[model samples]
Target chain A: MIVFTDLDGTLLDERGELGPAREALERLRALGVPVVPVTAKTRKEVEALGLEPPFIVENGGGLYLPRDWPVRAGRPKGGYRVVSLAWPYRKVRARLREAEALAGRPILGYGDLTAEAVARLTGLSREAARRAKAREYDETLVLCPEEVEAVLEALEAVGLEWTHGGRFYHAAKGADKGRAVARLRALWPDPEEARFAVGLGDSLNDLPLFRAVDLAVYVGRGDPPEGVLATPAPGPEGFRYAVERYLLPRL
Target chain B: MIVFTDLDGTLLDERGELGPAREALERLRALGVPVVPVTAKTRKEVEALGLEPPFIVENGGGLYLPRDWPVRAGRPKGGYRVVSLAWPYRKVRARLREAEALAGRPILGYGDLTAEAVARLTGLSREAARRAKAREYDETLVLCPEEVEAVLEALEAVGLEWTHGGRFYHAAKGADKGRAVARLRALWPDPEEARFAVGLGDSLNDLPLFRAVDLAVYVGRGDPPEGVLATPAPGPEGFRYAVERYLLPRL
Candidate 1:
């Protein structure tokens, strides 16, 4: 089995700190299943957590793993044997310039903001914002409801895709978190016959991740659909409960 | 046998003549092969052709057919059984408004253009433009390479897909002609076996059509891939050769 999870507002909680889910990660590791972090957070942001061998960064834009990565199916990117789903970050930057002009008041992106500015906007410290800026594939942006359409028109023209995440809009190649997980799943021994995946997430961005797995657990603020295992608990605490109550026995 | 053909650059020559390939279509009709036109053309535009039983229109945005349709699996829509692949045109219109704002200056789309304006811009006659404006499931748009990211961002923000096709960009609900053909193929007497498909087209839009078939014939101006059966001729002559040399012989 594989554990695919979203970090912010799910494992990291409201304060960007972990709760019981950290222990759950350890528990899964003990069980010998790979615990993959499928998140929109950048490599610098995720590198500090020291989660596991393989993880997804920038909302499935890049998949990172230790050397001789298990599912090293895609091209090399950065330190990890990776599956870089979206276009290179520079291409996104070029498109970003146009999107900025296209959006009514500008769809300001993380790449365009100073560390101080990003810190102020996202409640991250200056250093954290600095790390967050060290992204690879996707660029995150903020948009008001009224400024929605033209931004999409620009993105479509260039042939990109976007998805909603907590507190930001992510732009990248059309591939999503769930697809990245599938690539990871195919690496397991006798993949088609012997393996299964259990995914955990809290937002709309997580929907694709949920779709890729045998089961999904929603562990954040709102009520997800009835088919998903929605938890009343929030953040890592919810992640713990979900893993313990629903997954442990099954696994 | 099912013959999925493209118009404009494939079935019609540069002079817009049917040429020798018209006989190939006639042969298919005579041989009882269903000539299903998969095109970017509007319903009214395709309706005038008097082709075969079921047809696809507006790219893959909608599938329309005679009532009690062959593969009558979809809902009733505008006198034909329909399988809508995109969001309704009005929904696309609302998304277009946001996408336009997000794009620099404006991301102009079909919903905003008058028939006369469309006619002058596209070389379609005044009457043809009138039919072109009769859209149901998608809105077409044009954006520069510079303006692509955010417009796609806006479309994704509202859950829409933007596709590249002949002469334009289309915003829709993410259905493609190939999948529709798959649906059509299933309706045959022996869906599991004894059913072979032949698909024809020219551009990137036709890529999906190529994938959904047992054999793909490139009948347009340029050279298709080596593996794909490339016709020595262009337009209708090519179409005729492809059908007679490849498809008709197999049938």
Candidate 2:
């Protein structure tokens, strides 16, 4: 089975590092179950996690496939076949500016700040923040309640789509995990593995991913939306449980 | 031992609801342990969680004690004796206005928005947002990096202290978990219980609580800061492990 998982609150713990689930992930690896990270994290950020290639980033705005991978559709960039599923960062920034102007308010997107500034705003280190600011498709925004409706309305008018993550609002153009998952799955060379895609996540943003996969494991608090399986815990431990119960049993 | 825990990412799961650790918490309660919630969450939020009274709120900005508890220094409010540790909300609003003028930028605090607007920004229901906005001692701000230093400097100039949580920067006057814990500890009638305080948390904001407690269980990814015990997992499961190892063993 192909395992598609979120990084921040699924495989990785709250500190954005794999903890207890590292062993479980290693087990999955030894079993040859390809783990594809589907997340809002940037390419550099995902690489920093040392997760193998063939991953989704920027909330499915970009896909990075290994050079030797079966899929040959995307452009070659930095040792991988890169698929761009959303508008270029430059276009997203320009549209954000237009939306801000239309809303008659200032919107602070990652493109608007220096790396050092981004580090200060988020609790990320300077190096990590730099990687986070390296957006290829989506723009992350820090907004208040009063600014959201106007800003979102203007963004829609400017032909941009928006989604909310655990903390911030992300703007892109037709970018979501489900669409990206479908794109990757369509190109899957292994017919057997293609039939069973398991997704794991802990947030509303992952609903698209939940819908895209054959088995959806909701890790952490509250009930899983509708048909998704609810894990017994949150974060890495929850991921471990899902792997142990669902994936391991399948093997 | 008295147990103090942060909610959102500590005792409770990601959805702000208790999951796997509910049984463990019940075990602590059955053991006659006072499980006080020390969190950035409001009194209403804590109450909504159904944790027993004698809790800290607004990042140590306020302490809500049971009316029948030992100490009688604070005023009676709602069903508990409320101790004010930081500036009143009215004063905080006025000072925030002054700080905005000093920074030459608009600083949006919780007071500036309607409940509906807050609900939209925070993804909380309107009723939950209303409870969150019922701030007595602290103000939450949404600021970018360019705005942080100037606004924080202005706030300091206007006699306010600030600290950051996982998301936003919170401003108040001399409000921190350590000080509140100390204050509450001093009033403890049980001499033995006062000596062995325990804190469980998942973020840096809980550093004060860590320092104040006799034992600190840092749940979720990475090595915990310095001497704190790093839990085996994150969220409710991690909390459960800590309780099972450190707490239940004592029983």
Candidate 3:
């Protein structure tokens, strides 16, 4: 059975590493079950954790097949072996500037935006500005609720759309975790080997994965949004529960 | 009296714009006090705020000197300038790879390190690796702690060191914010003018500014480390307290 797992609050901990969850994954791997990590984490961050699964990194922004996986036999090829959807930096920056002009308040650009610039534009204290800038630059920018909508609209006008996963919003297109999962699934040796996909996550951003899989598992003590099967326990414990109760029997 | 201040926390709020703080600053300026913004923010971010003071952007990293500063006849030249400290991409990347090998953990290199070969060698997850590659292909990579340390150590071992500043760390040839401030003071039009410097900050990283200034105001509820003076309130409130209580009287 192919198992799709989410990172962050699911398999990975607050520090964004697979600590206690490593043992659980080892047990699954030992059973000849491939544990795929579908995450919003960057590829570097995921690789840092020593995970070599077929992963969906940067949320649904990009996908990586294990090097050993066989290439697709008959589909029209030429795209990257790994599918990726990312915003063009210069275009995004230009559009963001336009959004800021529309919003009336200065919009802060992280990653590319400077601490002093954020401080001056947003009127946020240097410390707060620095923190916000770090999040923006390190991950992605944040906007007020209305500004968020406006920014998304602006990005759309520039041939970009917002992809929400984990805590950050990205401007991307064409690829997502679901599509990546399906594409990778096509590479499987036995497509019908009594395979049941189990999807585990903790946020609304994970909805796509939930819909994509055979069984949806939500982790964390926080209430799961709307439609999804949630575990009684919280955090990684919830993940363990989902694996033991529903997934193990099928395997 | 010339009093230099940082904008964000010192004068602005969470939005990084100068509002109520601008009023106070204008009052100070009206009384013949020059309030300069010395910050790690970029010039674009600072200029966007509409506070057109002589600014120090990119920390002491990049310098943005205004076009209209008065030149003193016999006193040399200095006053307000912005600075940006950026490292060479290639040098930083090479050291990061070495450190990663030492740490026995895959270190994902962004900015200059993005390439198929580098990504494969680092074993970074696809998304992380791709973003790193994208950043390398597009924007300048912001400094990383490990990479910086590695570079610094290598330089020191070979009797060399570079100078620069960022939010997390400063690695240079003992040339830093304090030195920059000192150089500016040396270039001031009126060396005999009654000059008082008031510095405001939250993190320990801002200690240099605190030590260099006449009055160092620590924002937030947390106690300042040993020698620094703690502002009465926290965050913006504390910043307000510093400006109103300490700086207003001087102005």
Candidate 4:
């Protein structure tokens, strides 16, 4: 059966890495169960963890299947094969300009510049900008302190929309993480092989995944949002609890 | 009109910080324009940059609305008013358990453990966990190898999810930066006055924010996502370009 798990609180601890839970995973692997990591991290970020198996990274923005998996026709290019639902730069710029005028604020833009150039303009250390550049999504980042309503009002005036991430904000139209997940599911080898989807998280941002999965897991010591399963241990320990309790016995 | 801008790319330059941006911000302030600092950085991170305004730190996850702004009801009980959509603990654990089963490898879990406990478990220096602990969405963290599919499968089985930050993966719901922005917007006075929102970023992860703003700006030189305005310069210079192009003209 296929299993999908989140990385942070589900497998790792607050330090952003996994540790004690490794033993349990090894045991599961011995049982030959396929595990997948569906996260918002980039492929590089996922790779850095040194885990094996397929992955859904960048918040369903991209999917990486094993080389052994059968190739499908019309698949997008790139290592992780990211699927974008963003507008073209020209249209995005037009919308941005219009939004700025509506908002009465200057809109920041990052276009047609080298990583070094971007670093120079953003005041990010060259290294930081370079690191950001290495990722697959080719989009400019913008910021503002105005309220979302203000931003939405301006965009709505121009027939545009926005998406959110961990830090910056986005203005675009396309699939959300949920849509992306659905898309990925369509490509699965055996959609109904006793397989199930699970979602783990800590913040409200993870709500969509919670809704998408068969079981919703919440880590950490924070108060749980409405309609989700909560782990008692918090952080990695909580993740371990979930692993041991749910997946381990089955394996 | 309120003019919200990012600090690193929209205001500061790579030579540490930007004097022109600061001067420009000061000028805007003198003109009674609300010059806010919006960034992906933490409160301390932004404060270290020495730029001051109503701080929107942690990629909209945390809002430091200067004491001057109208306060929202049920405000966060801690240092900064943190607006999040993180996952609960129990659900996260459930996903972790499944991930462990699928990966067949050792996974780490950090729930209920002190930072020291996490450090000991992960074989990382205590200092690393300590630092990572500060930005953790959950009280714990997870670490694993590159075989993330195993984790993904496990999560799928349980219905849990995760997200990513500048560093580390987060087991969380599918909430994005936009959700946080929306929550913050609810707190604004005369929300209509905002009229527009702007987003600034340089990485693929910033796509959500790019799609969520009225004005989507790409700061610095990294390739921007499809629907973003490219700044004239790179890094801090790009931030300056945004200010000059979008904000200065209005002023």
lDDT for each residue of candidate 3 in B1-251, tens digit (9 for 90 to 100)? 55555555556654555555556666676777766666645455565566574555444444445545564222222444433343333444455445434643322323323243233333445544454343111122233333455545544553323443223232223334554465566656677552566667665446766777777777734678678888666555666566688777753
Q: What tens digits encode model 4's per-residue C-alpha lDDT throughout B107-225? A: 34444234554444444467654543454233233433343556556655656554443333455444356655555556667676466666666554466666666777787566667
Off by over 4 Å in 3: A72-81, A85-95, A101-105, A113-139, A144-146, A156-159, A193-195, B1-251
lDDT of 3 at B162: 42
Flag the better candidate by DockQ, 3 or 4: 3
- Here, model 1's chain A TM-score works out at 0.90
Q: Native-vs-model 2 lDDT?
A: 0.83
Reference contacts preserved by each model: 0.00, 0.00, 0.00, 0.00
Please give the lDDT score for candidate 1.
0.74
Error of 2 at B85 (Å): 34
Which scores better on lDDT, 1 or 2? 2
* DockQ each: 0.01, 0.01, 0.03, 0.01
Q: Indicate the TM-score of model 3.
A: 0.46
Candidate 1 lDDT over residue span A156-235, tens digit each: 77666888886677788745898888877776544743277888998889999999998888886888756899876888
TM-score of chain A of each: 0.90, 0.97, 0.75, 0.72
TM match of model 4 to true structure: 0.42
lDDT of 1 at B230: 84
User: Of models 1 and 4, which has the larger lDDT?
Assistant: 1
Compare candidates 1 and 4 on TM-score and give the better one.
Answer: 1
DockQ of candidate 1 is 0.01
